């Protein structure tokens, strides 16, 4: 809800960079996605349409910092 504290939503933004940091950092063929990376990468990318901009804004800096890393 709108009237939560924010460190809630920045603290769950933090981690699911920290997490999409850890995971993944082993995967460099450009072409590897075999049952769970495909289904990650697609519960990010079909959020980027989302009614609420911090789902949107997480998505688009996740897909940012994990191009950024592999």
């Known amino acids: 809800q709108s009237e939560a504290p924010?460190?809630?939503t920045d603290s769950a933004e933090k981690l699911l960079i920290?997490?999409?940091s850890i995971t993944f950092a082993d995967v460099k063929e450009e072409d590897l996605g075999n049952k769970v990376l495909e289904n990650t990468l697609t519960d990010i990318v079909c959020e980027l349409s989302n009614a609420n901009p911090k789902v949107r804004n997480a998505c688009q800096k996740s897909?940012?910092?994990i191009s950024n890393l592999t």
Do not use: W
Request: aromatic share 0%; charged share 10%.
């Open 6 to 8: 924010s460190a809630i």
């Open 18 to 20: 920290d997490l999409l």
């Open 63 to 65: 897909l940012h910092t």
